[PDB]
Amino acid sequence: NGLTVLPPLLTDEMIAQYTSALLAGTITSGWTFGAGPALQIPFPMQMAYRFNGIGVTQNVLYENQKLIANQFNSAIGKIQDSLSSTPSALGKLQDVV
Amino acid sequence: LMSFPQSAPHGVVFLHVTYVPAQEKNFTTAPAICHDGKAHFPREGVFVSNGTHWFVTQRNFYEPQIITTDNTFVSGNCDVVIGIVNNTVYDPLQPE
């Protein structure tokens, strides 16, 4: 009846590549890649910079990096658990579609 | 840094003067320095090494400075921090 849906310009693969590039730049350069050229930096130092930005001294991170990494891994696991537990996480996109 | 507005027909033009770094170089870094069996952490700089010595510089501009007591603060011992290296710490009171 004339209703034609056009595909988007950037496919799912290109969006995934953009997301992976964003993630790699974030984990390898912090915020330097967004302002200009990417500058490599260890991720513990990036976390120390973030803690200094939120008003926490970096020694608290350099003394509890192990616990912080464990908590981060547990939170990442719980995120996937919540995503697989109920489809209400993407309810906004589902309602749009 | 700063922006300058400009009048335009049915609009406005901002001249965003921004700071863009360039000419970067690779340096060896360490999370902390251990001299008197105690951990040292930079207050605002970052520990860097040019292969021969260790210096403290800004996180946005290369400016090597001697690792002094005024630039670092002690917090805990060395065996807790992972990746800590051994290097002497300068003290301005010692020459006097």
UniProtKB/Swiss-Prot annotation, chain A:
Lineage top rank: taxon: Viruses
Phenotypic consequence of D95N: In strain: Delta/B.1.617.2, Mu/B.1.621
Region (Heptad repeat 1): 65-97
Role according to the record: Subunit of the fusion protein that is processed upon entry into the host cell. Mediates fusion of the virion and cellular membranes by functioning as a class I viral fusion protein. Contains a viral fusion peptide that is unmasked after S2 cleavage. This cleavage can occur at the cell membrane by host TMPRSS2 or during endocytosis by host CSTL. In either case, this triggers an extensive and irreversible conformational change that leads to fusion of the viral envelope with the cellular cytoplasmic membrane, releasing viral genomic RNA into the host cell cytoplasm.
Record's protein name: Spike protein S2'
